[PDB]
Structures are given as structure tokens and as C-alpha cells.
Design an enzyme around this catalytic site. Sequence first.
Site, PDB file in Angstrom:
ATOM      1  N   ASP A 113       0.810  -1.224   0.000  1.00 29.81           N
ATOM      2  CA  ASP A 113       0.000   0.000   0.000  1.00 29.81           C
ATOM      3  C   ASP A 113       0.845   1.276   0.000  1.00 29.81           C
ATOM      4  O   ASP A 113       1.176   1.828   1.075  1.00 29.81           O
ATOM      5  CB  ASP A 113      -0.911  -0.011   1.243  1.00 29.81           C
ATOM      6  CG  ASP A 113      -2.005   1.025   1.183  1.00 29.81           C
ATOM      7  OD1 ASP A 113      -1.959   1.937   0.311  1.00 29.81           O
ATOM      8  OD2 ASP A 113      -2.902   0.943   2.044  1.00 29.81           O
ATOM      9  N   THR A 114       1.107   1.814  -1.193  1.00 33.55           N
ATOM     10  CA  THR A 114       1.907   3.028  -1.310  1.00 33.55           C
ATOM     11  C   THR A 114       1.208   4.279  -0.717  1.00 33.55           C
ATOM     12  O   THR A 114       1.879   5.256  -0.393  1.00 33.55           O
ATOM     13  CB  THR A 114       2.304   3.323  -2.768  1.00 33.55           C
ATOM     14  OG1 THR A 114       1.119   3.479  -3.555  1.00 33.55           O
ATOM     15  CG2 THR A 114       3.227   2.196  -3.362  1.00 33.55           C
ATOM     16  N   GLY A 115      -0.122   4.238  -0.573  1.00 34.40           N
ATOM     17  CA  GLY A 115      -0.872   5.322   0.066  1.00 34.40           C
ATOM     18  C   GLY A 115      -0.924   5.278   1.595  1.00 34.40           C
ATOM     19  O   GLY A 115      -1.525   6.142   2.224  1.00 34.40           O
TER      20      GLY A 115
HETATM   21  C1  LIG Z   1      -7.206   0.995   3.771  1.00 37.84           C
HETATM   22  C2  LIG Z   1      -6.914   0.654   2.323  1.00 37.84           C
HETATM   23  C3  LIG Z   1      -7.191  -0.832   2.072  1.00 37.84           C
HETATM   24  C4  LIG Z   1      -7.796   1.461   1.357  1.00 37.84           C
HETATM   25  N1  LIG Z   1      -7.510   2.900   1.272  1.00 37.84           N
HETATM   26  C5  LIG Z   1      -6.275   3.399   0.646  1.00 37.84           C
HETATM   27  C6  LIG Z   1      -5.132   3.679   1.621  1.00 37.84           C
HETATM   28  O1  LIG Z   1      -3.937   3.712   0.820  1.00 37.84           O
HETATM   29  C7  LIG Z   1      -5.289   4.975   2.428  1.00 37.84           C
HETATM   30  C8  LIG Z   1      -5.121   6.270   1.618  1.00 37.84           C
HETATM   31  C9  LIG Z   1      -5.323   7.445   2.546  1.00 37.84           C
HETATM   32  C10 LIG Z   1      -4.252   8.254   2.924  1.00 37.84           C
HETATM   33  C11 LIG Z   1      -4.452   9.321   3.810  1.00 37.84           C
HETATM   34  C12 LIG Z   1      -5.727   9.596   4.303  1.00 37.84           C
HETATM   35  C13 LIG Z   1      -6.791   8.780   3.934  1.00 37.84           C
HETATM   36  C14 LIG Z   1      -6.592   7.712   3.053  1.00 37.84           C
HETATM   37  N2  LIG Z   1      -4.302   5.008   3.484  1.00 37.84           N
HETATM   38  C15 LIG Z   1      -4.512   4.697   4.760  1.00 37.84           C
HETATM   39  O2  LIG Z   1      -5.563   4.374   5.284  1.00 37.84           O
HETATM   40  O3  LIG Z   1      -3.268   4.712   5.516  1.00 37.84           O
HETATM   41  C16 LIG Z   1      -3.320   4.862   6.918  1.00 37.84           C
HETATM   42  C17 LIG Z   1      -2.182   4.004   7.437  1.00 37.84           C
HETATM   43  O4  LIG Z   1      -1.027   4.851   7.309  1.00 37.84           O
HETATM   44  C18 LIG Z   1      -1.389   6.228   7.334  1.00 37.84           C
HETATM   45  O5  LIG Z   1      -0.910   6.935   6.165  1.00 37.84           O
HETATM   46  C19 LIG Z   1      -1.983   7.633   5.524  1.00 37.84           C
HETATM   47  C20 LIG Z   1      -3.245   7.392   6.347  1.00 37.84           C
HETATM   48  C21 LIG Z   1      -2.911   6.266   7.319  1.00 37.84           C
HETATM   49  S1  LIG Z   1      -8.703   3.879   1.431  1.00 37.84           S
HETATM   50  O6  LIG Z   1      -8.253   5.249   1.399  1.00 37.84           O
HETATM   51  O7  LIG Z   1      -9.508   3.617   2.575  1.00 37.84           O
HETATM   52  C22 LIG Z   1      -9.579   3.641   0.100  1.00 37.84           C
HETATM   53  C23 LIG Z   1     -10.639   2.739   0.061  1.00 37.84           C
HETATM   54  C24 LIG Z   1     -11.344   2.556  -1.118  1.00 37.84           C
HETATM   55  C25 LIG Z   1     -10.977   3.284  -2.253  1.00 37.84           C
HETATM   56  N3  LIG Z   1     -11.654   3.150  -3.413  1.00 37.84           N
HETATM   57  C26 LIG Z   1      -9.946   4.194  -2.208  1.00 37.84           C
HETATM   58  C27 LIG Z   1      -9.236   4.363  -1.041  1.00 37.84           C
END
Ligand SMILES: CC(C)CN(C[C@@H](O)[C@H](Cc1ccccc1)NC(=O)O[C@H]1CO[C@H]2OCC[C@H]21)S(=O)(=O)c1ccc(N)cc1
Lengths: 99, 99
Positions: free
Chosen positions: B25-27
Site C-alpha cells: 500500500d503506497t498510500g
Molecule cells: C485501507 C486501504 C485498504 C484502502 N484505502 C487506501 C489507503 O492507501 C489509504 C489512503 C489514505 C491516505 C491518507 C488519508 C486517507 C486515506 N491510506 C490509509 O488508510 O493509511 C493509513 C495508514 O497509514 C497512514 O498513512 C496515511 C493514512 C494512514 S482507502 O483510502 O480507505 C480507500 C478505500 C477505497 C478506495 N476506493 C480508495 C481508497
Amino acid sequence: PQITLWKRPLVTIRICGQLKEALLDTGADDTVIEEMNCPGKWKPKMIGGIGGFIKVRQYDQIIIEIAGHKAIGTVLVGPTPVNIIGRNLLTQIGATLNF
Amino acid sequence: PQITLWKRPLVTIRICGQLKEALLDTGADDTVIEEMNCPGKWKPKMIGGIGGFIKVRQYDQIIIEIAGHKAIGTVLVGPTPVNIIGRNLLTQIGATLNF
Ligand SMILES: CC(C)CN(C[C@@H](O)[C@H](Cc1ccccc1)NC(=O)O[C@H]1CO[C@H]2OCC[C@H]21)S(=O)(=O)c1ccc(N)cc1
């Protein structure tokens, strides 16, 4: 280009005539863009992540340019804290994860 | 490997002796794993994602094997919808995004 992951993988995108910064996100199935008053027909969706669900508007066949690369597909618009380019458009710009 | 994004980038990980499925998960800044027993001390933290904030246990210096590559670092344990390997460990296994 090659993007290392020491920092958030943010790139400039163009959508609906607006420039935004967005996260290249391998963990997102779909592309989610922060709230904007855009035209077009849409369907309600709910998308779930860490913390629970947000309500979004699903627009189909939306054109977006991601770091100079053209893409066209589903864009979800709603109260996301960050603009997220998900796999549906990452595949279209030829993005891979490598190690 | 080179991983394309038509499917979710799911790999097998080994953490605290246990095999689990996890999403590359790069996000995600941080690695977040579903509730499980982990040995040693931890500290309470909170983290936020698309739907709001959750409470997690932060374990530091956890040895984790990711698709055959060794990392040792921070793992957050809590009620995440999916096991996610975030940038704090993707950087350790030499992962980059490429297009
Ligand atoms: C939880 C994942 C399976 C799915 N997600 C993408 C995810 O990359 C999010 C993307 C993301 C990033 C920031 C804010 C909200 C969402 N990051 C995230 O939840 O990371 C958390 C853990 O490390 C921290 O770094 C960033 C937030 C924390 S998600 O944002 O909930 C998501 C779900 C469904 C879709 N269509 C698009 C995105």
C-alpha cells in the site's frame, strides 16, 4: 519515472480542468478525489477504509491526466482527506510496484 | 518482482511467526495489521484514514518477512479492514513505483 517511497508518492493531476496534487495509491481499488462542484451524472456509493465509510459520488468515464499521462475511468468524489489515484487508473498509466 | 495493478497487490507476510495476507500500500505511511497477539511492549496510538480515526497498539522493531524480503520496524495493530504494508516497511524492501 521511478518514485521512491521515503515520502508520500504525490503527483500533479488535471481533472475537470483543475490541477490538484494526488497520492499514487496501490492500496486503493478506486480513485477518490476531494469534494468539488463538478458537472455530470453520477451514482451514490459508499467506500470503506480505516475508520469506516464515506459517502461519495461515482462518475464514470472521467478524463484525468496523471503526471502527464492520460487516463479515463471511474472517479469517486467526496469528503476524502486526500486525493487518491487508485488501481483503476494506475494500470492505465503503466504503473507497477517493483522490489 | 515487478507487480502490475490489475489485481490487488496482495502478498504473504510472516509476523510473530504467523503467516498472513497483506496489501502492499503506497498510500499508507504506516503498516497496520489486524488485531492479533504480538509479544512485547507497545504503546497506544491513533491513526486516521478515509473514514476517520481508530485506536491501535504500536509495536516497534518487529521482524516481518514480506514476500520473502526481510523488514524490521513499526507495526500498528488494530481494527483495520485489511492488513496493509505501508511505506515505513516498503522502503525497507526496496519497493519503488514505476511508470
Ligand atoms: C485501507 C486501504 C485498504 C484502502 N484505502 C487506501 C489507503 O492507501 C489509504 C489512503 C489514505 C491516505 C491518507 C488519508 C486517507 C486515506 N491510506 C490509509 O488508510 O493509511 C493509513 C495508514 O497509514 C497512514 O498513512 C496515511 C493514512 C494512514 S482507502 O483510502 O480507505 C480507500 C478505500 C477505497 C478506495 N476506493 C480508495 C481508497
